[PDB]
Design a protein around this ligand. Structure first.
Ligand SMILES: [Mn+2]
Ligand SMILES: [Mn+2]
Lengths: 286, 286
């Protein structure tokens, strides 16, 4: 395990739909302006990012970076197609390399399967292929001082693990010291038996947190029991990354936004949303 | 509007994954055993129902029947392909005919689009095509004393309407006296700004209700603010069908279950689930 600290991050797609030179400056300036400790960069295509320019931007705005991504059908490490697993391994190493290059310590999100709506349930071979891939990734990450955090997402985004309890079981099969559980209030709101059970069960195994409202808009305008969730984090004295995650048709990444079915505009003012989000969070945890 | 009354029902998939002679009896017996007033039949293929056998089963167990369905890509009434919209019209009239033969009064569910994940947001033409299809269905249903209830579902299941407010606007465009809004607490838990706003807004336009827990499992083991929702229903003095809807890998309809991403086993004992659900509901609304 590599060092974790209580720090507050904003997801790139709060500010930018793409990670062009401009997009990168806008998001990084955005997060720094709002008072975030770090930006979480979406690395669905880790070859299109200008790492040197991004590194300069992080220096310029005195801001840290972690990275999240979701694999695609072409890079699905659950695939019983060895070629498709190899493409996944290759993308996760590239993502790890980019993250290392930016002085990052956390690779999180849906890194263990294709992000999206599977047409049917996962076979044991799908899960087995997933476990073996996170072992290979954890071993590669470990050489570069990087922790991986597997994000438990709802039934429409993965067939592998939809609850923290399922994630902890999968993690025990992975059995790597730098592999952790990643919980997201948005996904918890759908799948979990209250907002506390998975956090209490995780303890030190919880390595990353996403704060998202039930509809993924303004914090406090949805159904998520944040009082419950933040109570649970306190009970295990959680000290790791907490990134605000939000999606509106206002800022769209052609792939990720349609994958996440972001059909409505829940906000327009990135700075208002991000500023209010960090306030909301620090009021209830810190 | 055709007569509505405050009556309690269970969704077929609580007991049975198919509507074979055996599956129909199992669902109807299950509903009757728990003390439900009606069974809600999933009619995704209305041609496969043995209507006489089902009619005999309802008589035998002294149970009423309502019908819910989702369209598929092949029958999507939002399609810009006129042949696909005509297929939709044809299926919805077969569903209506079936319901009519069972002496039914409510065709509800995702009757206005293909149930599932859309690759992108709905155009005005998609919505216009939908409204016109629901107008044609409503006029056909009216001749057979059948109301249609438009079920608002989360972003992963439709790109047409994701909140009650959006559903009410769609509903006003349809402008038919036997057309109503259908709310489902499972979908509400995701998309809605609290559990009261859409219900207070709907008043007499709310024609049909589904009771689903946040994870579609045991009522009261999830995140759904039922106390808020039932307080809202009381405010508008709702007197219509209330269906307990639940999905577990324990009982699989090969199509519906996978379309709804039912990866997890949230129950095994249909009778225990269904019995506790009705009690839970009648305790909070009666
Ligand atoms: Mn997330
Ligand atoms: Mn429903």
């Amino acid at each position: 395990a590599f060092p974790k600290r209580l720090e507050y991050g904003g997801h790139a797609l709060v500010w930018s739909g793409d990670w062009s030179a401009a997009g990168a400056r806008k998001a990084i300036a955005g997060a720094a302006r709002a008072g975030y400790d770090y930006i979480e960069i979406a690395l669905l295509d880790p070859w299109q990012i200008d790492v040197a320019l991004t590194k300069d931007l992080l220096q310029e705005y005195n801001l840290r970076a972690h990275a999240s991504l979701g694999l695609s059908a072409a890079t699905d490490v659950t695939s019983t197609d060895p070629a498709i697993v190899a493409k996944g391994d290759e993308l996760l190493r590239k993502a790890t390399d980019v993250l290392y290059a930016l002085g990052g310590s956390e690779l999180c999100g849906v890194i263990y399967c294709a992000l999206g709506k599977y047409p049917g349930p996962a076979s044991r071979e799908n899960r087995a292929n997933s476990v073996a891939a996170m072992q290979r990734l954890a071993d590669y990450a470990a050489d570069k001082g990087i922790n991986i955090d597997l994000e438990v997402v709802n039934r429409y985004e993965t067939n592998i693990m939809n609850t923290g309890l399922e994630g902890l079981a999968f993690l025990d099969e992975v059995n790597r010291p730098n592999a952790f559980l990643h919980l997201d209030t948005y996904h918890m709101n759908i799948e979990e038996n209250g907002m506390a059970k998975s956090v209490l069960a995780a303890g030190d195994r919880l390595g990353y947190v996403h704060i998202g409202e039930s509809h993924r808009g303004y914090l406090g305008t949805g159904n998520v029991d944040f009082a419950s969730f933040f109570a649970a984090l306190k009970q295990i004295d959680y000290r790791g990354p907490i990134t605000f995650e939000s999606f509106s048709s206002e800022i769209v990444d052609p792939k990720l936004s349609n994958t996440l079915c972001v059909w409505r505009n829940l906000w327009h003012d990135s700075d208002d949303l991000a500023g209010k989000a960090l306030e909301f969070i620090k009021q209830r945890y810190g």
